[PDB]
């Protein structure tokens, strides 16, 4: 793909409806641990182990300890230059009658923290719960989410499992349910929410410019979105630290940390 920031800016000047697809690179640039890279472990596990239906059916306490840790660490994490440029872009363009939507695979809500309003969280959120009995989804920001998790979740190898009985894990407060809650996070092997996918498809069908930022383009179906925008003729620009399997499918590729190249692109 082309490397010309000058040509990208010419499309941006005239774009009325911009889709920005963001991946784990945006989050890593805030120091958010995602436990996906080689070497990135919580105790003896990675996300490929614990962000799974298997892990929750086998040891829901361990899964909750992992997500509790991840919730607690967010107190120390802030949006980075890429989040801020993306949020400011949406605000500035919205005054002009131009739409910016963020479709994120990240679950840490840093886009919302930076001020993004038009946000589709395709893999859910660390700060939502889903009831495994009634299916109700709820926002939840309480530290700790339940009393038994107080002080739990430490990441050091050799830390003992909390082995919290299921009744002391987070429970549904819907009158008459009390089922076991799980994080409202899409796990590996699970289907994304069709309603969210419908909203994604609407934005992809109407946008006139698409950016793919900070993602390896190896997790599906997300890695397919920006490929299908290119089919209607719409330009796609990739901002990532390295080429990906999907790089050659795009009009532009800008190498570098997201927080370095995005502010220039969206100014």
């Amino acid at each position: 793909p082309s490397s010309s920031m000058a040509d990208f800016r010419k499309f941006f000047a005239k774009a009325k409806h911009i889709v920005i697809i963001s991946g784990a690179g945006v989050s890593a640039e805030s120091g958010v641990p995602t436990f996906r890279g080689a070497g990135g472990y919580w105790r003896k596990w990675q996300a490929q182990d614990l962000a799974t239906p298997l892990a929750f059916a086998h040891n829901p306490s361990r899964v909750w300890e992992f997500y509790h840790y991840r919730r607690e660490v967010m107190g120390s994490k802030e949006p980075n230059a890429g989040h801020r440029a993306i949020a400011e872009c949406e605000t500035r363009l919205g005054k002009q009658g131009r739409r910016v939507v963020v479709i994120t695979q990240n679950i840490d809500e840093l886009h919302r923290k930076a001020g993004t309003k038009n946000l589709l969280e395709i893999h859910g959120s660390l700060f939502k719960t889903r009831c495994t009995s009634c299916g109700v989804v709820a926002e939840n920001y309480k530290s700790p989410i339940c009393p038994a998790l107080s002080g739990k979740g430490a990441p050091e190898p050799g830390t003992q499992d909390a082995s919290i009985p299921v009744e002391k894990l987070p429970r549904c407060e819907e009158a008459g349910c009390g089922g076991l809650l799980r994080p409202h996070v899409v796990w590996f092997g699970e289907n994304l929410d069709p309603a969210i996918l419908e909203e994604v498809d609407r934005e992809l069908a109407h946008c006139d410019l698409c950016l793919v930022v900070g993602t390896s383009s190896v997790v599906y179906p997300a890695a397919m979105f920006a490929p299908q925008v290119a089919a209607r003729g719409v330009p796609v620009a990739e901002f990532n630290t390295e080429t990906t399997p999907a790089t050659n499918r795009f009009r532009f590729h800008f190498q570098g940390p997201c927080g370095t190249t995005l502010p220039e692109a969206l100014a």
Binding site: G189, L192, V218, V219, Y220
Partner: peptide, 4 residues
């Protein structure tokens, strides 16, 4: 479609 499912998450890879």
């Amino acid at each position: 479609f499912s998450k890879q």
